[PDB]
DNA sequence: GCATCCGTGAGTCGAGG
DNA sequence: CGTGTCAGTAGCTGTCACGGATGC
RNA sequence: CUCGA
């Protein structure tokens, strides 16, 4: 779906591609290690804040 | 054996690992300084390593106890010392 | 081997708060 | 003194030129 | 904080 959206520009393409990591329960606790480190990423506990 | 005096290190270093970072920040809110947190948090993690009794039953939650042990020692710092001073 | 990022600097004097 | 169910900053980027050590 | 040259 984000192709999908995303599509009509080639600086998009270049986003998802060079993109490290893939997955809703992957990305969710890479965001949840930079925003509140120190501390057990749940899968949840991201979900929640 | 020795590989028991390591196996109580390596249950402190765990505890810090799952409750130190979240302590810090129910400190860091309560006394708005960070400096201070870590002070609280340290004496805090001491308490807890010279009580057995909140690091033997894993199945109780040994956070909620931090939390107490933690807001007794920042309003015993909210005394005397800190009124005329501060 | 080079783009990144860190740390440095940014008028003088005076009045009352 | 003892402490024990959720229990989780404010604030904020509306500076910039410039040089060189720091780093993928 | 605000003002004076």
């Known amino acids: 779906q984000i192709v999908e959206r995303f599509g009509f520009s080639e ?3 270049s986003t998802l591609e060079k993109d490290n990591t893939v997955g809703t329960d992957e990305a ?3 965001i949840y290690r930079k925003l509140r480190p120190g501390e057990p990423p749940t899968k ?3 979900q929640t804040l | 054996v020795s590989g028991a005096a390591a196996a109580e290190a390596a249950l402190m270093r765990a505890l810090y690992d799952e409750h130190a970072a979240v302590l810090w920040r129910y400190a860091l809110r309560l006394t708005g ?3 201070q947190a870590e002070d609280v948090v340290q004496e805090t993690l001491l308490r ?3 009580h057995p009794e909140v690091i033997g039953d894993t199945a109780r939650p040994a956070r909620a106890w931090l939390f107490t ?3 007794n020692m920042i309003i015993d710092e909210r005394r005397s010392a800190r009124f005329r001073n501060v």
């Open chain 2, 69 to 71: 042990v933690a807001r």
């Open chain 1, 44 to 46: 949840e506990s991201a």
């Open chain 2, 33 to 35: 300084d960070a400096a």
């Open chain 1, 28 to 30: 969710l606790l890479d």
């Open chain 1, 11 to 13: 600086i998009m393409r």
């Open chain 2, 48 to 50: 807890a390593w010279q």
